[PDB]
Structures are given as C-alpha cells and as structure tokens.
Structure 1
C-alpha cells in the first residue's frame, strides 16, 4: 500500500487557513482581515503643480518636476 496526500494552500487576507476550518467559516472570517489584491497608481511627478502647491512660484516647481521626471527616467534606464 502507498498513500501520498499533498495539500498546498495559499491565502491572501482573511483568517489563516488550517485543516480544521470549513469554507463557510473562512468566508465569514474576512469581515476584519482585508488585503489589497489589485491597485493602480500614477507617476509622482504629475501631481507637482502650482495648483497643488500655491506657496511656491511657477518656475521653481516646474524645475522640480523636470528634475524629478529626469531622475525617474535615469532610474528606469539604469536597470
């Protein structure tokens, strides 16, 4: 006789799994434990505007945005 039972369980969020929990309890246990599975973002240099920072002048924040975006470009090109 030969018996081989392999179970691989991968969880993201919710109550941690173990063989002693039913699927109902796992599904109802996600009331507090939450994990972001998907997300979207925007480049950081696009929010830099005098409209976002009225305190600073125009050309100063413009140069700030220019150096930030060229830093990002150098960062992406290095790798």
Structure 2
C-alpha cells in the first residue's frame, strides 16, 4: 500500500513571473527591473498639512 503525497508553494514578490523549473539564479539575474516595495515607512498625512 504505497502513497506519495507532494506539496509545493512558491510565493515570490516580485521578480520575473515564477515557474517551477526556474533556477535559483535566472530569478536573480532577471531582477533588473521588477522591483517591489518590500518594506515601507511614512508619516500620518495630517503631519504634511502645514
């Protein structure tokens, strides 16, 4: 009684449209544009009304 069970879940943001057979490299080299705000910080807008 044999039973494989495989999962997989990539979750990328953001580079070149991901696909399973992609190397861990051609991802990187293809990051020239396709940049994404991974972290951000700002102020409450009432502060800017001066």
Q: Rg: which structure is higher?
A: 1
The structure with the greater share of residues assigned to strand is 1
**Coordinate RMSD, CA, aligned:** 3.8
The structure with the greater share of residues assigned to helix is 1
Stretches of structure 2 lacking an aligned partner (at least 5 in a row): none
- Could you state the TM-score of these two structures normalised by the residue count of structure 1? 0.56
Q: Which runs of 4+ in 1 moved over 4 A?
A: none
How many residue pairs match? The answer is 49
- Could you state the TM-score of these two structures normalised by the residue count of structure 2? 0.82
Stretches of structure 1 lacking an aligned partner (at least 5 in a row): 49-78
Task: Report 1 or 2 for greater relative contact order, CA contacts < 8 Å, sequence distance ≥ 6.
Answer: 2
